[PDB]
Amino acid sequence: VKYVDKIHIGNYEIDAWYFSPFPEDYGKQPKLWLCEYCLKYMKYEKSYRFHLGQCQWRQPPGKEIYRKSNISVHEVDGKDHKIYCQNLCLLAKLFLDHKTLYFDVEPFVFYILTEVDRQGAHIVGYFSKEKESPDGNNVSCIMILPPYQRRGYGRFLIAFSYELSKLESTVGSPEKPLSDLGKLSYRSYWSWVLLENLRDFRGTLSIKDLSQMTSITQNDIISTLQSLNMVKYWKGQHVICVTPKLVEEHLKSAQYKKPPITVDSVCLKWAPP
Numbered sequence: 001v002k003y004v005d006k007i008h009i010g011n012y013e014i015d016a017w018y019f020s021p022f023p024e025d026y027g028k029q030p031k032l033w034l035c036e037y038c039l040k041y042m043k044y045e046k047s048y049r050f051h052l053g054q055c056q057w058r059q060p061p062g063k064e065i066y067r068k069s070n071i072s073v074h075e076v077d078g079k080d081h082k083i084y085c086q087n088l089c090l091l092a093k094l095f096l097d098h099k100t101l102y103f104d105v106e107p108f109v110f111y112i113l114t115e116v117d118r119q120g121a122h123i124v125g126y127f128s129k130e131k132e133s134p135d136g137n138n139v140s141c142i143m144i145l146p147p148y149q150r151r152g153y154g155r156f157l158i159a160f161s162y163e164l165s166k167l168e169s170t171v172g173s174p175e176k177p178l179s180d181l182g183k184l185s186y187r188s189y190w191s192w193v194l195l196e197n198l199r200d201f202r203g204t205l206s207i208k209d210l211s212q213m214t215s216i217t218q219n220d221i222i223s224t225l226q227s228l229n230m231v232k233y234w235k236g237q238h239v240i241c242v243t244p245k246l247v248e249e250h251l252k253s254a255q256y257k258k259p260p261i262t263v264d265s266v267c268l269k270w271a272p273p
């Protein structure tokens with residue numbers, strides 16, 4: 001171990017995927033030990049165990065803006081909770097090749113997804129978002145920790161990010177480049193959402209209509225619809241072209257059959273800043 005290559009967080013030991021610039025001294029130990037509630041990183045099992053008996057945090061800081069049953073989202077502003085956000089960024093960089101910002105967190109707001117039991121709210125993943133995005137990015141980085149990947153939580157967070165964009169009356173797209181798992185996940189999310197809308201209306205949904213209803217950009221609707229072969233091109237304009245039956249054929253594919261953890265807008269508490 002000369003870079004950090006293994007973390008212990010909660011009950012999980014996880015191998016790193018990429019370099020993250022924890023301080024040199026921390027990379028020297030066999031494992032880096034993180035408090036799963038405050039995200040403090042520690043060099044020894046003994047300092048970790050002492051910290052677990054002392055730390056009073058049982059959930060992320062900031063404001064719980066979503067709660068439904070034992071699923072919750074906390075909104076944490078990088079200026080109000082700098083240390084927690086820097087800790088989160090160095091933890092994320094272990095799984096993200098392309099994240100480059102770890103310390104200058106004050107331009108960002110972080111949305112932390114947790115799953116709650118009688119012990120406290122256990123981190124699953126997060127996304128960051130620029131407070132002011134000139135490019136209309138509604139996610140900067142998005143990361144689900146390995147033991148929760150491919151289990152519905154990424155789909156919930158991507159949906160969540162578009163729920164905020166809807167409340168802001170704006171469209172938005174993730175910042176590129178996307179990670180490999182992020183690309184597959186966005187493509188599957190957009191397809192599901194657009195197909196479900198195409199099934200529910202009939203029904204002069206234009207591409208514009210779909211962008212207003214979903215907060216998905218026109219370009220990302222178009223590239224999705226191209227991949228489904230649901231668009232024709234006429235004198236310089238992409239136009240929707242699909243039958244009710246074709247929409248149902250798509251939606252009967254294994255990929256759309258897992259039951260989603262849904263985002264209930266009744267349980268989201270948030271207004272634009």
Ligand SMILES: O=C(NNS(=O)(=O)c1ccccc1)c1cccc(-c2ccccc2)c1
Pocket residue numbers: 095096142143144145146148149150151152153154155156158179181182184185186188189
């Ligand atoms: O877990 C995921 N997706 N699988 S899923 O079951 O939630 C899903 C997502 C979208 C559509 C269907 C299912 C997921 C989604 C978005 C990002 C990441 C990720 C994790 C680590 C490093 C970089 C990115 C994973």
Ligand SMILES: [Zn+2]
Pocket residue numbers: 035036037038039040051055056057
């Ligand atoms: Zn702690």
